[PDB]
Design a protein around this ligand. Structure first.
Ligand SMILES: OC[C@H]1O[C@@H](O[C@H]2[C@H](O)[C@@H](O)[C@H](O[C@H]3[C@H](O)[C@@H](O)[C@H](O[C@H]4[C@H](O)[C@@H](O)[C@H](O[C@H]5[C@H](O)[C@@H](O)[C@H](O[C@H]6[C@H](O)[C@@H](O)[C@H](O)O[C@@H]6CO)O[C@@H]5CO)O[C@@H]4CO)O[C@@H]3CO)O[C@@H]2CO)[C@H](O)[C@@H](O)[C@@H]1O
Ligand SMILES: OC[C@H]1O[C@@H](O[C@H]2[C@H](O)[C@@H](O)[C@H](O[C@H]3[C@H](O)[C@@H](O)[C@H](O)O[C@@H]3CO)O[C@@H]2CO)[C@H](O)[C@@H](O)[C@@H]1O
Ligand code: CA
Length: 629
């Protein structure tokens, strides 16, 4: 039987759940897939509001798990997994096993350098550069009996807004698409959206392939997908809770547990260097696990031929603290129900749990906030790490891992998303490493929360950094990082970030007994409910400072390359963001946005992001369960 929950906060979870599932609100598509946001004029990570992301699906899982906890009905949780497998994990028609089974574990992929400016792409493949061997493929094919990968592709054009359709048909939905392809300086405003399944039917002569990669021969028709590791790890985390809560009620979500465990098994691909180069010795091809950094890197990607049979897989050399999930790592390495079928699954996750906690500690600034991360590939070309750069297991410290436009660790959101998982681990196990990280981090953030007399509040929005952490030495541990400092540049009222912050502080307060954390958490939840509630969940008016880029951001296109988007928009040198997405001019908010830009004002919007609304719903449920009185 489930323990008693605080009725006030449980009612708030239930109300939010109803608003989110309400057909009249429009959070979901006709096929039952959650959109990034109700509003369509939306550019920030995805570039259209009605795409879905693996991030959104993992939050949909978390929300349903919590609903099962309070309603005793888990059919909604099972459906969230059913929709995920059907639409976001490439089926056998999407990643043909005829091509995947031709994968060579001794030569996973061909090397190509990464560049610091989009104008340097396409990147040339070089078969002469070393690539290490993949030690886990044989464990996976043996356990699952297929060469296909079981992980979520990160983004999906749900209603076929771009027009690529399914597997080049131009009319089916949903449509697997990708955007980012050209390095750290390619922001969301600088991409050329392309289909994951490229048969050369759209774009240029060879589809969109030769805009990004250059091979010696003529480009082959091919498919390719990219995982967002933090999303798949959150799927495991949510499923573990669904399992606990269901068992407390004599119910079962067994089939969903099996899918989550399999997902966590394939997620181990994010533990490896991009081209399987030895960690700390980037010039050398790895011989197996010496190429594993054991952290959740920015991605793992795979692809292969459509017209011929071949395939490749790559991990990622770049690591950000914001993606780590020590809670998911503890579940997969210690809980018997979540033990992966592969021979080394549970043990690799046990190594990752230890490595991740060391990574967070190495990165903790003098004040408490967590710094960026590290990379095993300097400048994305395995260049020499400049002297004086501190390192973690041979990997050089990077202030803003992967992206510089804008910096990936300048947004406060990463702090709460990632520390929330540490709070859960601490709550369940009382781990000393987790406690040490949280005591300092929570002291830092509790001094940055500002409540106003009118009931509104502000938390850090944009942050900046100075210095670097001291080189990590595992036998000596944290030095205090006196030379690494965080600076809060400005404050804001991001409701998704505040809900995640409330969740983190609630788990931490329930275990540590810290009253300040508990009352700050409750004041954040009350403030949001009482002053930011609306008919669709919660919202506030926010400035869209980068929206001028719709009209003025030039998109790089190689000299002489011309092609067309499915709707006829011409892709060629000179185009702006809006030129290859002309359908946006039909958006209901378009004229309003443009009128503001014309008058020299910053456009504003009232947004209902799926992840933010679910975050607030879950934050209320966590509080109802941990503080029942
Ligand atoms: O000999 C057999 C046949 O070989 C063929 O040649 C093949 C060759 O074998 C193969 O190895 C080669 O593979 C390369 C691919 O062609 C190439 O496209 C691929 O590019 C990677 C790229 O290296 C990587 O940087 C890029 O990362 C992006 C990612 O795409 C994007 O989704 C991700 O987005 C994240 C967001 O940034 C984040 O905010 C959000 O939250 O999550 C998103 C998801 O993680 O961002 C990252 C980083 O910016 O991914 C692309 C893949 O899309 O690299 C391969 C390895 O080098 O292909 C060759 C040609 O196909 C011969 O052609 C044939 O004749 C022979 O028979
Ligand atoms: O890529 C990380 C996640 O980003 C989420 O979007 C956030 C933007 O990255 C962030 O820039 C924005 O915050 C702005 C805010 O909109 C503006 O009013 C203020 O002046 O400046 C802030 C800082 O630039 O917030 C959004 C929403 O939290 C994506 O929603 C998410 O999918 C993605 O993982
Ligand atoms: Ca740029």
């Amino acid at each position: 039987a489930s323990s008693p929950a605080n009725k006030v906060y449980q009612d708030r979870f239930e109300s939010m759940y109803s608003k989110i599932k309400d057909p009249a609100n429009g959070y979901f598509s006709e096929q039952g897939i959650p959109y990034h946001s109700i509003e369509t004029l939306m550019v920030e990570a995805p570039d259209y509001g009605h795409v879905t992301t693996s991030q959104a699906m993992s939050y949909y899982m978390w929300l349903e798990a919590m609903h099962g906890r309070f309603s005793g009905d888990f059919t909604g949780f099972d459906k969230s997994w059913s929709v995920t497998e059907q639409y976001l994990i490439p089926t056998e028609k999407d990643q043909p096993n005829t091509s995947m089974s031709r994968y060579d574990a001794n030569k996973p992929a061909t090397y190509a350098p990464e560049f610091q400016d989009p104008s340097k792409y396409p990147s040339p493949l070089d078969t002469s550069q070393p690539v290490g061997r993949d030690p886990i493929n044989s464990q996976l094919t043996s356990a699952y009996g297929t060469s296909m990968l079981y992980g979520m592709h990160w983004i999906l054009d749900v209603d076929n807004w771009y027009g690529f359709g399914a597997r080049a048909d131009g009319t089916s939905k949903p449509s697997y698409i990708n955007t980012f392809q050209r390095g750290e300086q390619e922001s969301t405003w600088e991409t050329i959206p392309q289909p994951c399944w490229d048969e050369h039917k759209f774009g240029g002569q060879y589809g969109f392939l030769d805009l990004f990669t250059k091979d010696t021969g003529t480009p082959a028709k091919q498919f390719k997908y990219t995982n967002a590791p933090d999303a798949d790890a959150r799927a495991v985390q949510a499923t573990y809770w669904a399992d606990q809560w269901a068992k407390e009620q004599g119910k079962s979500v067994s089939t969903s547990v099996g899918k989550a465990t399999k997902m966590g098994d394939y997620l181990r691909y994010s533990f490896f260097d991009k081209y399987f180069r030895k960690i700390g010795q980037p010039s050398q091809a790895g011989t197996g696990y010496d190429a594993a950094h054991y952290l959740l890197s920015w991605y793992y990607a795979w692809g292969g031929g459509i017209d011929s049979t071949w395939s490749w897989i790559i991990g990622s050399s770049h690591n950000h603290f914001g993606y780590q999930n020590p809670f998911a790592a503890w579940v997969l390495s210690t809980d018997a129900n979540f033990k992966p079928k592969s021979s080394n699954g549970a043990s690799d996750w046990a190594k990752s749990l230890d490595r991740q906690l060391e990574f967070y500690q190495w990165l903790q600034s003098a004040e408490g906030a967590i710094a960026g991360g590290a990379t095993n590939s300097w400048n994305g070309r395995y260049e020499a790490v400049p002297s004086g750069t501190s390192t973690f297991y041979g990997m050089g410290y990077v202030e803003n891992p992967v992206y510089a436009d804008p910096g990936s660790n300048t947004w406060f959101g990463m702090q709460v998303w990632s520390m929330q998982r540490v709070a859960e681990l601490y709550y369940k196990t009382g781990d000393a490493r987790a406690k040490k990280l949280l005591d300092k981090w929570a002291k830092w953030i509790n001094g940055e929360i500002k409540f106003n007399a009118d009931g509104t509040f502000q938390i850090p929005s944009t942050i900046d950094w100075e210095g670097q952490p001291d080189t990590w030495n595992p036998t000596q541990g944290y030095t205090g990082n006196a030379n690494l400092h965080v600076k809060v540049v400005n404050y804001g009222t991001d409701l998704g970030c505040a809900s995640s912050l409330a969740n983190t502080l609630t788990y931490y307060a329930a275990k540590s007994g810290d009253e300040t954390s508990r009352q700050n958490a409750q004041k954040l939840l009350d403030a949001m409910w009482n002053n930011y509630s609306d008919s669709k969940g919660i919202s506030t008016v926010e400035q869209r400072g980068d929206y001028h880029r719709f009209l003025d951001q030039e998109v790089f296109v190689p000299a002489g390359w011309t092609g067309k988007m499915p709707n006829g928009d011409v892709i060629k040198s000179g185009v702006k963001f809006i030129d290859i997405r002309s359908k946006y001019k039909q958006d209901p908010e378009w004229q309003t946005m443009v009128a503001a830009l014309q008058a020299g004002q910053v456009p504003t919007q009232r947004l209902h992001r799926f992840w933010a609304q679910s975050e607030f719903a879950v934050a209320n449920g966590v509080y109802a369960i941990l503080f029942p009185d």
